[PDB]
Swiss-Prot record:
Protein name: Arf-GAP with SH3 domain, ANK repeat and PH domain-containing protein 3
Primary role: Promotes cell proliferation.
Renumbered ranges of ANK repeats: 162-194, 197-226
Disulfide links within the chain: none
Gene giving rise to this polypeptide: ASAP3
Subcellular location: Cytoplasm
Organism: Homo sapiens (Human)
Zn finger region (C4-type): 19-42
Superkingdom in the source lineage: Eukaryota
Amino acid sequence: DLTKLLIAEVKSRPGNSQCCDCGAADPTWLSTNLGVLTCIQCSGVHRELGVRFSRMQSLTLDLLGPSELLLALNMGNTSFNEVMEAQLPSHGGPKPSAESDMGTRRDYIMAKYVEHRFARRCTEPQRLWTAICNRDLLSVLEAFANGQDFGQPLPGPDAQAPEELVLHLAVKVANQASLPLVDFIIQNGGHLDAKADGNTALHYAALYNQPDCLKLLLKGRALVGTVNEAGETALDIARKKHHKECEELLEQAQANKEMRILMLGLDAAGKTTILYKLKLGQSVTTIPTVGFNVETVTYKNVKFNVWDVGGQDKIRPLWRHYYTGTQGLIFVVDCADRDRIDEARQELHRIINDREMRDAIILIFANKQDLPDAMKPHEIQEKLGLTRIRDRNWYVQPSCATSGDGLYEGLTWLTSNYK
Ligand SMILES: Nc1nc2c(ncn2[C@@H]2O[C@H](COP(=O)(O)OP(=O)(O)O)[C@@H](O)[C@H]2O)c(=O)[nH]1
Ligand SMILES: [Ca+2]
Ligand SMILES: [Mg+2]
Ligand SMILES: [Zn+2]
């Protein structure tokens, strides 16, 4: 309603009437941390790269707020590709089109966003610092594309006795216009809970009166009450410099043998991925499933009627329909997606508490264990709020759909606990 406008404005950016990676008919899929638009076909490869590189939401199918659309309105395809496809020629270009071979698409998108082949080239410490205060997002992107690593600090101007890291600075010298860079930095190389006199990026926001910066920092879910050399928390500095507005948000910062399986979870969790590796034995490439999938897995003399339903924000209220006559629940959780865990917490708890769902076996796949910072199964139990789940039969199973690891074991548990 308030966002309808912003969506419409995102689409009308230069180059956004074509897919970022294959230039297809007006794309609906946003890589929220890059502010770019891809078709449903290119979209799936981003989901393959992980939330570490790309965070896909549909403008059409996911539920989006003003806050998530910041870079989208301030980036768009043309601006982005100007940097990232700078060394791409016109003729014989490796960049694909509308309906190209998945192999060719995949090979290109992986080289572009992860390896950064086609992006403009150079080194470089100070130029970044200059771009930040200049608020030149496009140059910051250039830096990011050449492999800058925002985690490590840069020397500053005259009498440079101390040393500050990228994000810390961007916050200090920020206003309304300075925002998207703050957001880009957080979502792309931002070691959010970094310290360096041991002041957090959170602390700084309270020192220089940066209300909108505080908003973005907690959106990325940040540490509160961490102490520095003075023994000051985020709340504490806001009082010493008496910056009124910030303190309001910091106070809120606290509070024979067959079986029908329903397989749910948030978008991009790996639901389809799991289902088809189990059914085919080989791993397959996956487009986001706009409807749902049904296949029958016959592992160890037991028929599994698996119902893989897509989990875009808009297509979740349809889950209710698949509850009736279900025995086992497979909730797939993307573990690399540390940001959307309380979302999965909520959506699982919304299911297992449905009055049409008590007599359900619950198997949680703690999927994507192969990815870098993965977040372990024990850590999943606690965060998914299974500590106080009693008189319910749950079981978290470490898995990696791409390789196949952990998957059959989950079934084994279903067989066994279908007593
Ligand atoms: N690294 C890794 N990637 C995975 C794993 N499972 C799924 N993926 C990727 O995540 C993306 C989303 O999978 P998908 O089944 O379409 O998610 P769905 O929307 O819940 O059905 C796919 O591109 C997969 O390549 C995993 O265990 N490890
Ligand atoms: Ca969402
Ligand atoms: Mg799916
Ligand atoms: Zn495309």
